[PDB]
Amino acid sequence: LPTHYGTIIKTLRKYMKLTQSKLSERTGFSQNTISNHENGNRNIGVNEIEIYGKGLGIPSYILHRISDEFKEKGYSPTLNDFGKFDKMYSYVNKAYYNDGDIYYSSYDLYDETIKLLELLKESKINVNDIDYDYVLKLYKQILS
Amino acid sequence: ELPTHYGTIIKTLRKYMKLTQSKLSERTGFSQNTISNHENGNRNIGVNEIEIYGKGLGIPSYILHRISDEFKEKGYSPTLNDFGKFDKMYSYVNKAYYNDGDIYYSSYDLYDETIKLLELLKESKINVNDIDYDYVLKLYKQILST
Amino acid sequence: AELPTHYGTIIKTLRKYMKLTQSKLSERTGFSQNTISNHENGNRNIGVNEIEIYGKGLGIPSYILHRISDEFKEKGYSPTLNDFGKFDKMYSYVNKAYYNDGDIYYSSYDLYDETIKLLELLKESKINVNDIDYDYVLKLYKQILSTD
Amino acid sequence: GMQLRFARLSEHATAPTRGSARAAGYDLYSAYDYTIPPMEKAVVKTDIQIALPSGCYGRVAPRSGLAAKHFIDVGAGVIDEDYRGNVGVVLFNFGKEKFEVKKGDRIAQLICERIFYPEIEEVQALDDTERGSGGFG
Amino acid sequence: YFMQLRFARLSEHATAPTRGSARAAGYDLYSAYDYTIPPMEKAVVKTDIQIALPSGCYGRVAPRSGLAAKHFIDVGAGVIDEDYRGNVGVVLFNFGKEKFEVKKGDRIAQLICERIFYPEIEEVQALDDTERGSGGFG
Amino acid sequence: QGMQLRFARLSEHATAPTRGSARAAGYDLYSAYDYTIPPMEKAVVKTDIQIALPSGCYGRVAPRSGLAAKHFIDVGAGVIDEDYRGNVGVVLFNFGKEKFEVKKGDRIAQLICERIFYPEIEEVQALDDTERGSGGFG
Numbered sequence: 031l032p033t034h035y036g037t038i039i040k041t042l043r044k045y046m047k048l049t050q051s052k053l054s055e056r057t058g059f060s061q062n063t064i065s066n067h068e069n070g071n072r073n074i075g076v077n078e079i080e081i082y083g084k085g086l087g088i089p090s091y092i093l094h095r096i097s098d099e100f101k102e103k104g105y106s107p108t109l110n111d112f113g114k115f116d117k118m119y120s121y122v123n124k125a126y127y128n129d130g131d132i133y134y135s136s137y138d139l140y141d142e143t144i145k146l147l148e149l150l151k152e153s154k155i156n157v158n159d160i161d162y163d164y165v166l167k168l169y170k171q172i173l174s
Numbered sequence: 175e176l177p178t179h180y181g182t183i184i185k186t187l188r189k190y191m192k193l194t195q196s197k198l199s200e201r202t203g204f205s206q207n208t209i210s211n212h213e214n215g216n217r218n219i220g221v222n223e224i225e226i227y228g229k230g231l232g233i234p235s236y237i238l239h240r241i242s243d244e245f246k247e248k249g250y251s252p253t254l255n256d257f258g259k260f261d262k263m264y265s266y267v268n269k270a271y272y273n274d275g276d277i278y279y280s281s282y283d284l285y286d287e288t289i290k291l292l293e294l295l296k297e298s299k300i301n302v303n304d305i306d307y308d309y310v311l312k313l314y315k316q317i318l319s320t
Numbered sequence: 321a322e323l324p325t326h327y328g329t330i331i332k333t334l335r336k337y338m339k340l341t342q343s344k345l346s347e348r349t350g351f352s353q354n355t356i357s358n359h360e361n362g363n364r365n366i367g368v369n370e371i372e373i374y375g376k377g378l379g380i381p382s383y384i385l386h387r388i389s390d391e392f393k394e395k396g397y398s399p400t401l402n403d404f405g406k407f408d409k410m411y412s413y414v415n416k417a418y419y420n421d422g423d424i425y426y427s428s429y430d431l432y433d434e435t436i437k438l439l440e441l442l443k444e445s446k447i448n449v450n451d452i453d454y455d456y457v458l459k460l461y462k463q464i465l466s467t468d
Numbered sequence: 469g470m471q472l473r474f475a476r477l478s479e480h481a482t483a484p485t486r487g488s489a490r491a492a493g494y495d496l497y498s499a500y501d502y503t504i505p506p507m508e509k510a511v512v513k514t515d516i517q518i519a520l521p522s523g524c525y526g527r528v529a530p531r532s533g534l535a536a537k538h539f540i541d542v543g544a545g546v547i548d549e550d551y552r553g554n555v556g557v558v559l560f561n562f563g564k565e566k567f568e569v570k571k572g573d574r575i576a577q578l579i580c581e582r583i584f585y586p587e588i589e590e591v592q593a594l595d596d597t598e599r600g601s602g603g604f605g
Numbered sequence: 606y607f608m609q610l611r612f613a614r615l616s617e618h619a620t621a622p623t624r625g626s627a628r629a630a631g632y633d634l635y636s637a638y639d640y641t642i643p644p645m646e647k648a649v650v651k652t653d654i655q656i657a658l659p660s661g662c663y664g665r666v667a668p669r670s671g672l673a674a675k676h677f678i679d680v681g682a683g684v685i686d687e688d689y690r691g692n693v694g695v696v697l698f699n700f701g702k703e704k705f706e707v708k709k710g711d712r713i714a715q716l717i718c719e720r721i722f723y724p725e726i727e728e729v730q731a732l733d734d735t736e737r738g739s740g741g742f743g
Numbered sequence: 744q745g746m747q748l749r750f751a752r753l754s755e756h757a758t759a760p761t762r763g764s765a766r767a768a769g770y771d772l773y774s775a776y777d778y779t780i781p782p783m784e785k786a787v788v789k790t791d792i793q794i795a796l797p798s799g800c801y802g803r804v805a806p807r808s809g810l811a812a813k814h815f816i817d818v819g820a821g822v823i824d825e826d827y828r829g830n831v832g833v834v835l836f837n838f839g840k841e842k843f844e845v846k847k848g849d850r851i852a853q854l855i856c857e858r859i860f861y862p863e864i865e866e867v868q869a870l871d872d873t874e875r876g877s878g879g880f881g
Contacts, residue, residue, distance in 0.1 A: 046605055076621045076866035087605035091623035091633075120603040123625075127600030130830035134674040134787055134820070138712060139625055191881060221483050221728040232881040236485035265879040268487075272876030275692035279536040279649055279682070283574060284487055320537060321755055338743050368590040368759045379743035383761035383771075408742050415763070416739035422554035426511055426544070426812040430850060431763055468813060472724040475731045484726055488875045490687040492663035492721060507838070511812050517732050521724050525768035525855065535681035535696050536649050543811035546853065549766045550735045558811045560838065562645070562698065577684065579663065580722035583768060584856035586746035586797050588760055593751045594795050599626055600826045610862040613869050622864055628825045630801030630859060655870050659862050673819035673834045674787050688873040700783070700836065715822065717801065718860035737764055 034100040035074035038093055038109060039067055042086050045112050057085035092119075095140045108144065117157045118150070119143045121165045129166060135173040145172050176246045180219035181212055183241050183254060184227050188213075190257050191231050202230035237264075240285050253289065262302045263288045263295075266310040274311065280318040290317055323393040327366035328359055330388050330401060334378050335360075337404050349377040384411075387432045400436070409449045410442070411435045413457040421458060427465045437464045469521020472580065477554055478515040482572055493529060493577025496557060502569040504561040509543060512557040512575050520549045524580040528557050531576060539563035542576055610718065611657040615692055618709055619653040622716060631667055631715025634695055640707040642699040647681065650695040650713050658687050662718040666695050669714060677701035680714050748856065749795040753830055756847055757791035760854060769805055769853025772833060778845040780837040785819065788833040788851050796825045800856040804833050807852060815839035818852055 043053050043064075050061045050068075059067070059081065066072040067082075074082075083090030099106035108115045122143045125132040136142060149168055150157050188198055199206045204226070211217035219227075221239070228235030237253075244251035253260045267288045270277040281287060291313055295302060335345050335356075342353045342360075349356070351373070358364040359374075368382075375382030384400075391398035400407045414435045417424045428434060438460055442449055472494065474484060482497035499515035520526050526547030534540035544558040557576045561567040569575060610632065612622060620635035637653035658664045664685030672678035681696035695714045699705040707713055748770065750760065758773035775791035796802045802823030810816035819834035833852040837843040845851055 076864065080863060080865075089625055091625060094621065094623065116603045120601075124596060124601050127824070127826045128596050128828050130789070130832055133670060133827060133829050134832050134834070135671050137671055221726070225725060225727075234487055236487060239483065239485065261879045265877075269872065269877055272488075272686070272688045273690050273872050275649075275651070275694050278689060278691050279532050279694050279696070281533055368588065372588060381742075381763055383763065386759065386761065412739050412741050416734060418763075419548070419550045419738035420552050420734045422513070422556055425551060425553050425808060426556050426558075427809050429809050469722045470724055471727050473727045473729050473732060475729050483728060486726070488686070488688055490723060490875060492684050492686050494726060509811075509815050509838070519729075519732050521722050524722055529684050530682050532682035532684060532694075532696070536647070536694070539647050539681075539698075541681050541698075543815075543817050544806055544808040546768050546805050546808060546855070548764075548768050550737050550764060552732050552734055552738065556808075556812070558808070560815070560817070562647075562700075562838075579684070579719075580724055581855075582720040582722060582858040584746050584797055584800055584858065585766060586748040586856055587744075588762070588770065589747040589749045590759060591749055591751050594749060594793050594828050596828055597826045599628060600828060608862070609865045611865045611867055611870065613867050621866060624864070626824070626826060628861055630822050630824050630857075632864065657870050659860055662860055667822050668820050670820040670822065670834070674785070674832070677785050677819075677836075679817075679819055679836070688876045690870045690872055690876060700785075700838075717822070717857075718862055720858040720860060737766065 032100070033074060033097050034106075035079065035093070035097060036068050036070040038096050038100075038106075039064075039074070039082050039086075041109055042082075042088060042093070042112065043068070045116075046086055046088070048086070053082075053085050057081045092140060111147075114147055114157045115143060118147050118165075121160075121162055122146065122169065124162070125166055125169050131170050132166075132173070135170075137173075142169065142172065178219060178242045179245045180224065180238070180242060181215050183238055183251075184219070184231075185213040186254055187231050187233060187238070187257065191233070193231070198227075198230050202226050204230075237285060256292070259292060259302045260288060263292050263310070266307050267291070267314065269307060270311055270314050276315055277318065287314065287317070321393070325366065325389045326392040326398075327371060327385065327389060328362035330385050330398075331356075331366070331374050331378075332360040333401050334374075334380060334385070334404065338378055338380075340378075345374075345377050349373050384432065403439075406439055406449045407435060410439050410457075413452075413454055414438065414461065416454065417458055417461050423462055424458075424465070427462075429465075429468070434461065434464060469523060469580070471519075471521055472578075473519040474516045476515065477517060480571060481515040484516065484578060491577075493527075493579040495574045496528065496555065496576045496578055498557075498569045498571055498573045498575050500569075500571055502559075504559060504567040504569070506561060506564055506566060509558060509560045510569070512559055512569055514555045514557065516555050517552050518547065518555055518578070519552070520547065521580060522549070524582050525549060526551075526555075527579045527581045528555070528576050529579050531574065534575070538567055540567060540575075547578075608659040610659060610716075612654045614654060616653040620710055622654070629715075631717045633712050634666065634693065634714045634716055636695075636707045636709060636711045636713050638707070638709055640697075642697055642705045642707065644699060644702055644704060647696060647698050648707070650697050650707055652693040652695065654693050655690050656685070656693055656716070657690070658685065658718060660687070662720050663687065664689075664693075665717040665719045666693070667715045667717050669712065672713070676703075676705055678705060678713075683714075685716075746797045746856075747795075748797065748854075750792045752791065753793060754791040758848060760792070767853075769855045771850050772804065772831065772852045772854055774833075774845045774847055774849045774851050776845070776847055778835075780835055780843040780845065782837060782840055782842060785834060785836050786845070788835050788845055790831045790833070792831050793828050794823065794831055794854070795828070796823065797856060798825070800858050801825065802827075802831075803855040803857045804831070805853050805855050807850065810851070814841075814843055816843060816851075823854070 480499035484494035528545040541560040618637035622632035666683035677700040679698040756775035760770035804821035806818045815838040817836040
């Protein structure tokens with residue numbers, strides 16, 4: 031039942047170092063609205079997540095997938111490590127739009143980001159050190 | 175070669191839609207004269223005038239064409255005979271097609287399917303006005319299944 | 321592409337064929353008489369972007385200049401450029417046929433290659449491209465495409 | 469572009485039809501009978517020529533019913549705005565059994581797909597885009 | 606501020622269409638159900654969503670690149686009219702040698718808002734051949 | 744000035760896309776390599792070009808009419824997003840009884856600049872049936 035969108039918005043607003051005032055200027059929601067959204071005093075669905083996504087600078091569907099984790103696990107690993115996710119996703123996103131082997135093989139960028147982070151973790155590799163060109167080779171490997 | 179019977183079709187449907195030669199002349203931009211020469215006979219009627227009469231009458235142009243072809247093919251139009259029963263049945267079929275996936279992903283032709291349902295209902299002594307959308311929908315799904 | 325393009329010769333030969341001066345082509349392309357002279361002489365480099373503009377300036381589809389360049393890379397000379405009058409006439413028929421005949425539209429592989437195959441057939445048969453009826457070309461064209 | 473002009477090339481043609489003012493395509497009708505065996509194709513003639521409105525091409529597109537019920541599909545489909553020949557529909561029968569077309573059968577739709585006619589430009593290399601790069605924000 | 610792509614769930618099995626990037630051609634469509642598609646067979650895969658496309662477009666249900674290139678999956682039909690308000694169905698063709706499994710929540714196609722003209726049909730006795738068709742160069 | 748389709752060559756093997764006429768729906772795409780497509784098989788055919796589509800369209804990789812009618816060749820996938828800067832591939836399906844040969848320099852498909860919307864998405868509880876989708880004549 032529960033979405034946890036309130037927590038997701040608060041956490042991502044903080045992750046992107048935005049004041050409620052700034053997110054308000056950008057989204058068109060007042061600070062009172064954003065506070066009630068964040069605190070669970072006002073329901074959040076698809077239509078609010080479209081606005082928040084644009085305001086945060088994070089594709090709306092990622093908030094859907096983070097919400098999906100909470101429901102499927104009790105918490106979101108990705109939200110807990112959003113810094114690692116933002117970094118890997120920037121590489122996955124780039125590979126998808128600039129490499130034919132990815133564009134003609136990829137099934138889902140968010141699931142592939144998660145698969146790659148799990149692979150870096152198991153290999154004891156740090157996502158902020160890895161070479162793009164090496165990420166690309168790991169990516170082609172998980173798709174094949 | 176064979177005549178279209180468009181004058182008679184237009185007249186019969188104009189009267190059915192309860193519009194005057196003047197109201198149709200309003201909506202179409204054909205002179206109350208031109209309209210009469212078209213119904214009275216001799217003045218001819220192209221697919222291009224039938225597009226204008228369709229919009230004028232508030233009936234899909236293509237149904238005039240399919241009525242005209244009942245005449246060319248069979249010398250009579252069961253649709254133009256009981257047009258009020260055809261309007262009712264068409265409205266249910268049109269609704270089904272645009273609002274139900276089973277029909278949208280199965281229909282071949284909305285007109286032929288209206289006919290085939292009226293014919294199944296005439297041969298059940300069931301009156302169209304005496305049944306409802308959900309009744310028509312069950313039957314429609316049955317005849318589209320193979 | 322390693323092999324040179326020979327675009328300088330192609331533009332000079334086609335501009336002359338169209339009975340244009342450096343100056344008139346200059347007015348149409350936007351290239352100065354200096355630039356055009358330097359293209360034709362083979363001094364300045366000529367790529368797809370210049371050929372798009374030269375195409376519009378000459379009233380010749382740009383891709384034909386590409387095709388003519390390919391004749392040099394493959395043969396060391398261009399039969400098309402050597403007898404362009406004939407190519408222009410036969411291409412006008414092939415083009416009209418592609419856009420107006422459903423048998424051609426639903427079978428054609430390449431208008432350029434088919435213009436060449438048709439000109440080869442007329443030379444064999446000693447028929448003049450300037451004299452042949454369109455309705456006869458069309459029968460020749462369907463025959464050439466019948467092979468495949 | 470408000471006008472789709474057409475002309476009959478034979479007595480066998482049917483005028484294209486559109487039930488609704490906002491249907492995506494005009495219905496196209498076969499002008500002849502054809503028997504398409506399983507796993508074969510055919511070129512179905514309409515015996516109509518068209519003049520598309522300016523700024524579109526004509527896409528010959530599948531009927532949903534023929535696709536979902538009979539495993540019928542449309543290959544080809546691109547009609548250039550300058551094409552004045554006979555409009556042909558390339559039908560693909562991927563079904564287990566033969567597919568019968570009779571004269572006057574509705575076999576496809578014609579959509580006026582709006583498109584650009586862009587000029588071509590070579591560059592030495594294209595930059596990875598601002599959306600095809602960068603982290604969030 | 607419209608216009609938009611409106612949709613509604615017909616069941617709890619639906620997934621809200623998703624688009625990874627502001628300029629992706631298509632919205633992602635998700636299966637609401639399990640399906641097994643044997644080799645050289647087809648299936649109508651339900652989304653359990655209904656959509657109201659914006660004005661001046663139809664909805665094209667278009668193939669996924671990876672699904673085609675790796676599993677020989679294709680999309681039949683795919684025309685969705687402005688007035689269609691039924692369950693959005695995807696007609697999947699499996700031209701592969703192996704059966705293709707669809708699970709609830711699998712991405713099986715994309716929805717493209719294809720911009721179109723809705724023109725008026727006009728019969729004419731004969732069209733002329735266009736100038737562009739022939740003439741000579743120059 | 745005029746809308747530009749920008750491309751760059753990813754190898755010496757690529758051919759610059761071509762258009763016979765100012766109003767052709769598609770630019771011609773060329774194979775950069777030799778392929779042999781067995782009966783009822785597919786192959787990803789590389790052009791070794793990258794493209795920058797103009798704003799407001801996606802690139803549709805669309806079948807050639809001749810190849811369809813004479814050799815039962817079709818195009819799978821075929822959606823190129825505005826942001827795609829990778830090698831443009833053509834997913835060719837050979838549905839023919841005979842194998843289909845691709846040589847380097849062969850025309851295997853056309854690229855159409857399909858105008859689309861990029862709509863915002865809005866969930867509602869239920870879509871009402873349309874006017875044109877309800878009631879009788881009048």
